[PDB]
Design an enzyme around this catalytic site. Sequence first.
Site, PDB file in Angstrom:
ATOM      1  CG  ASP A   7      23.033  43.156  18.188  1.00 27.70           C
ATOM      2  OD1 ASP A   7      24.234  43.068  18.511  1.00 27.70           O
ATOM      3  OD2 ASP A   7      22.573  44.168  17.625  1.00 27.70           O
ATOM      4  CG  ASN A  38      27.578  44.979  19.113  1.00 32.43           C
ATOM      5  OD1 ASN A  38      26.745  44.206  18.647  1.00 32.43           O
ATOM      6  ND2 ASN A  38      28.707  45.291  18.482  1.00 32.43           N
ATOM      7  CG  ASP A  88      26.648  44.357  15.315  1.00 31.38           C
ATOM      8  OD1 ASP A  88      25.734  43.771  15.928  1.00 31.38           O
ATOM      9  OD2 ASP A  88      27.724  43.792  14.989  1.00 31.38           O
ATOM     10  CG  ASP A 114      26.480  39.929  20.213  1.00 34.22           C
ATOM     11  OD1 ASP A 114      26.123  39.602  21.366  1.00 34.22           O
ATOM     12  OD2 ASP A 114      26.115  41.006  19.673  1.00 34.22           O
ATOM     13  CG  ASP A 156      28.933  22.325   6.364  1.00 34.33           C
ATOM     14  OD1 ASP A 156      27.710  22.475   6.474  1.00 34.33           O
ATOM     15  OD2 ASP A 156      29.609  22.769   5.405  1.00 34.33           O
ATOM     16  CD  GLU A 187      24.588  19.365   6.124  1.00 37.24           C
ATOM     17  OE1 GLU A 187      23.605  20.072   5.770  1.00 37.24           O
ATOM     18  OE2 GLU A 187      25.759  19.547   5.701  1.00 37.24           O
TER      19      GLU A 187
HETATM   20  O1  NOJ Z   1      28.695  24.926   3.799  1.00 36.62           O
HETATM   21  C1  NOJ Z   1      27.719  24.751   2.718  1.00 36.62           C
HETATM   22  C2  NOJ Z   1      26.397  24.433   3.441  1.00 36.62           C
HETATM   23  N1  NOJ Z   1      26.627  23.252   4.259  1.00 36.62           N
HETATM   24  C3  NOJ Z   1      25.450  22.841   5.049  1.00 36.62           C
HETATM   25  C4  NOJ Z   1      25.005  24.027   5.977  1.00 36.62           C
HETATM   26  O2  NOJ Z   1      23.890  23.646   6.753  1.00 36.62           O
HETATM   27  C5  NOJ Z   1      24.659  25.250   5.103  1.00 36.62           C
HETATM   28  O3  NOJ Z   1      24.237  26.371   5.891  1.00 36.62           O
HETATM   29  C6  NOJ Z   1      25.921  25.657   4.295  1.00 36.62           C
HETATM   30  O4  NOJ Z   1      25.623  26.807   3.454  1.00 36.62           O
HETATM   31 CA    CA Z   2      26.169  42.266  17.806  1.00 36.36          CA
END
Ligand code: NOJ
Ligand code: CA
Length: 557
Positions: free
Chosen positions: A22, A24, A26, A30, A200, A254
């Site tokens: 991070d 900034n 918060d 980032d 994903d 994945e």
């Molecule tokens: O998008 C649903 C699920 N897909 C697989 C990702 O690794 C996980 O972080 C995410 O919550």
């Molecule tokens: Ca930040």
Amino acid sequence: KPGAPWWKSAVFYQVYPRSFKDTNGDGIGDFKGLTEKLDYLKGLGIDAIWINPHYASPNTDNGYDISDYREVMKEYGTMEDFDRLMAELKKRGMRLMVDVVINHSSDQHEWFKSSRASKDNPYRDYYFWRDGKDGHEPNNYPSFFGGSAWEKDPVTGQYYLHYFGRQQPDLNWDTPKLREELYAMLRFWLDKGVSGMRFDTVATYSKTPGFPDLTPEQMKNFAEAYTQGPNLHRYLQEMHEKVFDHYDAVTAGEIFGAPLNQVPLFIDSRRKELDMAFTFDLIRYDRALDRWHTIPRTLADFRQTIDKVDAIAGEYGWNTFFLGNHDNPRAVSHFGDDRPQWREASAKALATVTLTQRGTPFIFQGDELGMTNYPFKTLQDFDDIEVKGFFQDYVETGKATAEELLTNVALTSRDNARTPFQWDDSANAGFTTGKPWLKVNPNYTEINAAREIGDPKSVYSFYRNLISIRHETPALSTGSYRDIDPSNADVYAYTRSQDGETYLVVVNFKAEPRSFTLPDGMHIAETLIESSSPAAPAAGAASLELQPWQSGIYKVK
Ligand SMILES: OC[C@H]1NC[C@H](O)[C@@H](O)[C@@H]1O
Ligand SMILES: [Ca+2]
């Protein structure tokens, strides 16, 4: 020649931006923070970085619920910051892999706001809308994040599908116009110079026509059922034809939930679908079907799973290899021994395994430091939507007590991998000057980058040296793999060979001394590196005496 693609010999590092650095105050990592740390990654020897979702998002699932695919997440910075990250990586000869989340979008995406307005809206079919049945949902599909995978929208009275959170409606790949929009979106990022894309839940894009109920059997492992859509490979092949065939980016899917025997359909290079696969057979080898309990396993199960996954790659496929990611407990806690007296030794042993596996290794941020699981004390210490889902499915239903959930999820929760990266021993381990979004592990006082970088005996230095060795030794990258003895539950030993050169990797997974006899005819030639070893074997050795958790890589003859 032909030579292997750059991605087959590369060592990737996974950065979960939100928890990396991070800048900034918060409390959220980032882009500027990641950019400021590229020298750190370059020094470690990293060739490419895979960053979790960095697009505009309400963050109900930390980036995986995208509301605008062409805008950067407000928390991480601006497009300018993303562009700068890209430029700084290139100056260092590094590549960037981004996360592509197109199984679903956020319910705040403009497509969804439109889709839900009426049955005749032009975007209605960008999602799955269905009439309920027998007074309830369209069918019995459950959601990974709690309750039904179907949510009723009173605006039309129909239910929309969401395998994950209710704020993550599934995209309808059966709709050509939606597919074309997704392709244009991919080209938008590819045109900016992105070198890779990790897809994903790539195996769930095709839904089953008619949405029939899952059988009692399928219900126990619904994750697998969701990967059996009839048009899956047709969609993946179309995407490759329309997008990737025009770029030089590596694609990694994945493949969560899919039976191992189907993985070749995704990665066989001849099928022109994906380049490599992330499978979860190993990372979830000791996870119960409900995903929050663990089942005791041994090294025999561990190596046999690796052997099965390696075999599936055949000659035209390719695997990624990882012992941890943002959705799983920390590697040393999960596969090693994170107790104080064994943490460093086992973390080095696991590093040796990771960097000598056949496939492209991915190192999750912090594992090079030997970071561990976090000491959660109450259910409120978890931020993860998945834990709230287990609470809904198991505690509110009376199946388990809140204490039982805590006890078990503390060992398997995704939040274990999401605590802030431990940079040094300053306030909140140097991750932020503000209050971190997720508490820093108190062990940062002894586990931190600043402390390990200048120490030749640290976990970091060992990772760094292993990465050098891997880069200089072809066989350890693209070489063949052979498990010396799949039934052995104490010492993991295998060979990597290529062009007449063979290397032996031997790792003691026990916290006790063990012995290892090399295969008949095989003898030690040279010792490349060892961890937790008092002395290397002598040239010609036909056996090795191993210290607890000792690991080593040897050239054999
Ligand atoms: O998008 C649903 C699920 N897909 C697989 C990702 O690794 C996980 O972080 C995410 O919550
Ligand atoms: Ca930040």
